[PDB]
RNA sequence: UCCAUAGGUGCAAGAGGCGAACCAGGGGAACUGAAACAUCUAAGUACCCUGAGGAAAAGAAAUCAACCGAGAUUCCCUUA
RNA sequence: AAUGGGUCAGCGACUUAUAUUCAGUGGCAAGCUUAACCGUAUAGGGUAGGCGUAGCGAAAGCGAGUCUUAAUAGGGCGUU
RNA sequence: AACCCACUCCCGUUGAAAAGGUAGGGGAUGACUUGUGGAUCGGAGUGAAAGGCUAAUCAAGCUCGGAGAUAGCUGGUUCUCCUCGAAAGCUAUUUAGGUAGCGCCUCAUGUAUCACUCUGGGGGGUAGAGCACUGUUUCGGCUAGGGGGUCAUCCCGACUUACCAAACCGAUGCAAACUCCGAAUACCCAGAAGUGCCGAGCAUGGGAGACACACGGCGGGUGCUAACGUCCGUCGUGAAA
RNA sequence: UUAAAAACACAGCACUCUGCAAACACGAAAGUGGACGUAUAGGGUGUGACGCCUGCCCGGUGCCGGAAGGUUAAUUGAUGGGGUUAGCGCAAGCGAAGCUCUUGAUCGAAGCCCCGGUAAACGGCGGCCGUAACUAUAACGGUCCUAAGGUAGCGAAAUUC
RNA sequence: UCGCUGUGAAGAUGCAGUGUAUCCGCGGCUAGACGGAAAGACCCCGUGAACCUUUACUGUAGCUUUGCACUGGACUUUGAGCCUGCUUGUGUAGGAUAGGUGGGAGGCUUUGAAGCGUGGACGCCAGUUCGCGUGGAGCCAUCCUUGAAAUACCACCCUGGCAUGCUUGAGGUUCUAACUCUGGUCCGUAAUCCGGAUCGAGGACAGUGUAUGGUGGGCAGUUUGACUGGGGCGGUCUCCUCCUAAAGAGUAACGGAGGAGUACGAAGGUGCGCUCAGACCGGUCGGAAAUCGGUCGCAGAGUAUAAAGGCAAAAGCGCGCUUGACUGCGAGACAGACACGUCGAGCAGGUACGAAAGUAGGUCUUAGUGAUCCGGUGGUUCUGUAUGGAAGGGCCAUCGCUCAACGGAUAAAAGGUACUCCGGGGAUAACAGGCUGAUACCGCCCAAGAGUUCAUAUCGACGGCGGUGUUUGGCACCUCGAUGUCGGCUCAUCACAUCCUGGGGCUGAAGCCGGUCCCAAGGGUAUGGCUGUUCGCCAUUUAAAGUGGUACGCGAGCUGGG
RNA sequence: GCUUGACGAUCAUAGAGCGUUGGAACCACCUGAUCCCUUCCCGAACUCAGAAGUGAAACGACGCAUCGCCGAUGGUAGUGUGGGGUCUCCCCAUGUGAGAGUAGGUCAUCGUCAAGC
């Protein structure tokens, strides 16, 4: 099925977003830009683990 | 069993039993409640047993406080 | 043709204590009221304590404001 | 025979008797019967075993305490008058004969809306109807073709449609889960006259009860368009007249 | 005190435990019974004179034996990770020793897993296709499954719709 | 304190209509007063009770394993540590030797006794240490070159293991002195108890305390859902779509039909661009259907997934860029018992596509879900029990539940009761009564046909219409503070849809016998074998061995076989 | 007012089909692919530079009801309220009133601006 993952901001903040992904069809990591409330810009967010 | 130990008799003093409650200890339930029931509660209650007294118990900080201080134990009213 | 009563006389079922909330009726009034306890013992003392006069926030805290928030924007709660 | 037992019938059943009697019946020197004294008992005793017996009490004796155990369950609840006056529904529940919030009753305070009718706006997809879609039905025609035959062609041209025939044309029915259509009523909204028992509406508090409904009419499902059957909607009555 | 029997007991049979301070039972324990007995004895279990007999299955569950190897308790405390602070540092922050909070290496028996026995231990003991000079049925062949597929005797029976 | 027929919480002495009837005893019989007696024992219910079972849950007595204590000496085997000279150092390569550093450039203890070997050797083996057979004798030439670091040198750590020392894990043997003896003989003592003494035996075992693993219905406290045309068995329990649903919303049934417990980093955003299915004609292998060209076509295609409602600014299809599947909010509404749920303009921050107006807070919409408690992870100008910190707590973000009985009792749970018990219920079953009449039974309508011919002497297919309450059922209105249920005996009473006897019509009625229909209820209407039987089958009779109602008549009349 | 373009109003009485007609301007076809821009290939479509030719096609205007679409009057069905019957269904009084069909209509009607007279 789809497994819960965690997107950690590339800035120094500890802010993160949560989503799910199909780890069988798409094994490679996600590199997406999302708004970071602490620093107040859009920055690269990188996939990590939820556990 | 050699010494002396156990043991055996004779005297003196004391104890033993009863009593409704109160006190200090030893042992210690279940119904019930949780709208079921195991942790929990009822409750260290009911009950059983042992000591003491007119009361008993506890009592004179290896105690609390908070950088200011208080000043043995027991009981009552608050903090609640 | 469901229950109860053979009849009479007597007895027989919403109570009390402590904490509270609302209403009525009184005393004081930005204040009201004492508890244990003293006592000349229903008086008088005793204002420790309780409620009210300010709220918001989980809190530090700030205060007619405060919380959320980057925001004196909006919004929640509160204020003559 | 005595003595110990208890197989059968009848009587008795408010008995002479809370287990007997008259007739018959079994054992009767033995694993026999019996007197006196003694031992084992309450989750314990004893039992040639029936869950039997332990003082007329036994799938756990009696008695006194915990104790006024707990009882969403039955029963009962005592003088008088006046005003108002229900519900048997929704939701949830280890819930279904209990309880909780809401709907319905009553009292108090505050506040300004409410009902009926007329006029004017609005949406709908039901009754009815229809076949334009989806299905389903009958008749006639016209057929593409399967080819029934088939001259019978090594097997091809086809002789020809005496069987079948999609599709198309016309006529003709049906539908809770079909619709090219489409009411009456009922629902919202606004503006107005009068009536309202002097109020109707709304909000906030004090107290509840009730959450087993019944029949009759109308609209339906279920049943057999059977039931004083059962389950819904909407009125009326009973409940409480 | 509604059931006297086909129910219980029984003599006989079998299995199993027990070497004596016996197994076992009643007792918080002392002790007592077993028994002032001693394996021809004592306890438990099933069957139930006598006659003829008592077939197959150790896969499950139990019991007995084995001990190699896997797991496996309290116990032990290697290692790693933090808390405090003498000292250094402008600060930020680093920081020895002590005490302290965690982590858990190593050690560790029976048991269980494993291996083998045992049914008068608790238990279990089948199907489907063809095949004979009329028909019918298969002495005979295949084939699936199992731990193994009910023997001798008896049978509309205290069992048979 | 009458009968009958109706009515009626549905079987009336008491109600309605009607008929009978002076008032009161005694002896008898039991049909009724749903007669008396026992708050139904059968059935269901209660978040009731007892006792029993087990591979239900959780425990526990007993039995057993190991650590520590009581508990000691010696010897031996055996693993680790520590102490010790640290000798022991032999690969391409260096005569020879490669674990390294500091003093050091040569080594003059009998130099380094030199040339081979000699006993003990080891050995990445032909190399090295230790006595040169002779004897106090000059070779290893220090980079002599090579070798990654050169010997000889004096200190500092380590390595293959020897010899011991000091511990300490495990095993075996042995001893006596702890402990044990329900063994002997002496004493207390007049004593099979018990002590003390002494012989004998066992012996640091056994046993007991404490800690811990295994086993353990021997014993204990409990659990084991609800709905339900009675309970049980079966099925269901949360969410979405349609009908039922009566043209606003909502609306039940163990009513009729289907789906869900997901998917997608592009299947999202944006800008630009474009229209399907199908048919026919023509065209190489395919030929009905591949790709192609033309005409018609208007959505009969498509939409990630059920159905319904939608879809041209297409919401369908393709391409380029991209991350708005953004953070803080949020006027106002829809729904609604609550807890939850749904839509959303607009403002502030930063973005993405477009020239721009602009669009973007996921997907055409409606299913794809689980509260609180507890525990974990990332942050935090909060708190932090004398103080400074820390532990812990609070706040924000986020993980772990077929808790599917889906508003989820507990972290943790199955059965039997005919040995049963209590509180209740005709709120709910079995018997009888009531309603109904599908079924049952009895009539009638039509007439294909059978009857040699001939529809109706006698029958009668396919179909239709009634009657009676009379079987099997449906319902659950009465009775659970009790209305005794099959069959037999005794005694009955009524109906007529008549079995015999009586009177008739037709006949496929010669007579004697029959068949069928109409009228008729006065009187009659077997005995046995089997079986508990009603019934049925048999045997033998009779004029005939009728069918039904009466609580399937009759237990305060008998019986007790079922 | 007459003709042509662009944008609207309204969505078939406005559509479809058949036929006649329009080039002075406007529009359309048209020439070429050098330059911007383009084809998952093609200047086919989009785009650019135009002025030789035509009104063939497309578009517009005008006629025709064959089809499509509208559609009365009257009657019928259903239905709110009150009352009846022989009550699974109907009738009466009062108010309301379809769908289908029939007679019959339809080859639209407007607004703003710019160009030719
Ligand atoms: Mg005394
Ligand atoms: Mg308890
Ligand atoms: Mg309880
Ligand atoms: Mg309770
Ligand atoms: Mg209980
Ligand atoms: Mg307690
Ligand atoms: Mg105690
Ligand atoms: Mg005294
Ligand atoms: Mg003292
Ligand atoms: Mg003190
Ligand atoms: Mg001081
Ligand atoms: Mg003092
Ligand atoms: Mg009466
Ligand atoms: Mg009764
Ligand atoms: Mg009752
Ligand atoms: Mg009564
Ligand atoms: Mg009575
Ligand atoms: Mg006042
Ligand atoms: Mg504010
Ligand atoms: Mg405010
Ligand atoms: Mg006698
Ligand atoms: Mg006799
Ligand atoms: Mg006798
Ligand atoms: Mg006799
Ligand atoms: Mg005899
Ligand atoms: Mg005797
Ligand atoms: Mg006794
Ligand atoms: Mg007892
Ligand atoms: Mg029994
Ligand atoms: Mg007694
Ligand atoms: Mg007795
Ligand atoms: Mg109590
Ligand atoms: Mg009581
Ligand atoms: Mg009652
Ligand atoms: Mg009134
Ligand atoms: Mg719900
Ligand atoms: Mg109840
Ligand atoms: Mg109220
Ligand atoms: Mg209809
Ligand atoms: Mg149709
Ligand atoms: Mg046809
Ligand atoms: Mg319809
Ligand atoms: Mg008035
Ligand atoms: Mg209820
Ligand atoms: Mg309620
Ligand atoms: Mg109800
Ligand atoms: Mg009901
Ligand atoms: Mg109802
Ligand atoms: Mg009703
Ligand atoms: Mg009806
Ligand atoms: Mg109905
Ligand atoms: Mg009815
Ligand atoms: Mg009813
Ligand atoms: Mg009704
Ligand atoms: Mg009503
Ligand atoms: Mg009324
Ligand atoms: Mg009532
Ligand atoms: Mg009346
Ligand atoms: Mg006998
Ligand atoms: Mg007897
Ligand atoms: Mg017996
Ligand atoms: Mg034996
Ligand atoms: Mg036997
Ligand atoms: Mg036998
Ligand atoms: Mg084996
Ligand atoms: Mg075995
Ligand atoms: Mg073994
Ligand atoms: Mg440290
Ligand atoms: Mg190990
Ligand atoms: Mg082991
Ligand atoms: Mg064997
Ligand atoms: Mg056997
Ligand atoms: Mg045989
Ligand atoms: Mg047989
Ligand atoms: Mg026989
Ligand atoms: Mg059998
Ligand atoms: Mg009379
Ligand atoms: Mg009646
Ligand atoms: Mg009657
Ligand atoms: Mg009367
Ligand atoms: Mg009367
Ligand atoms: Mg009357
Ligand atoms: Mg009499
Ligand atoms: Mg009599
Ligand atoms: Mg009588
Ligand atoms: Mg009675
Ligand atoms: Mg009672
Ligand atoms: Mg009862
Ligand atoms: Mg029972
Ligand atoms: Mg329950
Ligand atoms: Mg309950
Ligand atoms: Mg002994
Ligand atoms: Mg002795
Ligand atoms: Mg000795
Ligand atoms: Mg030992
Ligand atoms: Mg030991
Ligand atoms: Mg021990
Ligand atoms: Mg031990
Ligand atoms: Mg048990
Ligand atoms: Mg038990
Ligand atoms: Mg257990
Ligand atoms: Mg037990
Ligand atoms: Mg209990
Ligand atoms: Mg229980
Ligand atoms: Mg439970
Ligand atoms: Mg139930
Ligand atoms: Mg049922
Ligand atoms: Mg029923
Ligand atoms: Mg079930
Ligand atoms: Mg509706
Ligand atoms: Mg409606
Ligand atoms: Mg309802
Ligand atoms: Mg489903
Ligand atoms: Mg899409
Ligand atoms: Mg659709
Ligand atoms: Mg478009
Ligand atoms: Mg609303
Ligand atoms: Mg831009
Ligand atoms: Mg912009
Ligand atoms: Mg919990
Ligand atoms: Mg501190
Ligand atoms: Mg903290
Ligand atoms: Mg539930
Ligand atoms: Mg639920
Ligand atoms: Mg629950
Ligand atoms: Mg039970
Ligand atoms: Mg009872
Ligand atoms: Mg009862
Ligand atoms: Mg009933
Ligand atoms: Mg019920
Ligand atoms: Mg009866
Ligand atoms: Mg009945
Ligand atoms: Mg009938
Ligand atoms: Mg014939
Ligand atoms: Mg009838
Ligand atoms: Mg009857
Ligand atoms: Mg009912
Ligand atoms: Mg009755
Ligand atoms: Mg009853
Ligand atoms: Mg009664
Ligand atoms: Mg009776
Ligand atoms: Mg008779
Ligand atoms: Mg009669
Ligand atoms: Mg007759
Ligand atoms: Mg007849
Ligand atoms: Mg007759
Ligand atoms: Mg006759
Ligand atoms: Mg005749
Ligand atoms: Mg007759
Ligand atoms: Mg007769
Ligand atoms: Mg007669
Ligand atoms: Mg007569
Ligand atoms: Mg006569
Ligand atoms: Mg007879
Ligand atoms: Mg007979
Ligand atoms: Mg018989
Ligand atoms: Mg009769
Ligand atoms: Mg009758
Ligand atoms: Mg009958
Ligand atoms: Mg009867
Ligand atoms: Mg009869
Ligand atoms: Mg009788
Ligand atoms: Mg009888
Ligand atoms: Mg009798
Ligand atoms: Mg009677
Ligand atoms: Mg009698
Ligand atoms: Mg009997
Ligand atoms: Mg008998
Ligand atoms: Mg009209
Ligand atoms: Mg019309
Ligand atoms: Mg029309």
- The DSSP secondary structure of chain A, one letter per residue, reads --EEEEEEESSSS--EEEEEE-TTT--SPPEEEEEETTTTEEEEEEEE---
Residues contacting A28, CB < 8 A, separation 6+: none
Cβ neighbours of residue A25 closer than 8 Å, sequence gap 6 or more: none
Burial of A28 (0-12, 13-18, 19+ CB in 10 A): exposed
Task: Tell me which residue of A26, A20, A25 sits closest to A2, measured CA to CA.
Answer: A20
| Shortest CA to C1' contact from A40: nucleotide | F350
Q: Which two tokens stand for residue A10?
A: 């590339």
- Local structure of residue A29 (DSSP, 8 states): P
Smallest CA–C1' separation from A16: which nucleotide? F397
CA dist A30 and A13 (Å) reads 18
CA distance A34 to A27: 21
Beta carbons within 8 Å of A15's beta carbon, 6+ residues apart:
A9, A36, A37, A38
């Amino acid at each position: 099925m789809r497994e819960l993952i965690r997107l950690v901001s590339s800035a120094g903040t500890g802010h993160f977003y949560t989503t799910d992904k199909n780890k069988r069809t798409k094994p490679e990591k996600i590199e997406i830009k999302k708004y970071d409330p602490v620093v107040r810009q859009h920055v690269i967010y990188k996939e990590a683990k939820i556990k």
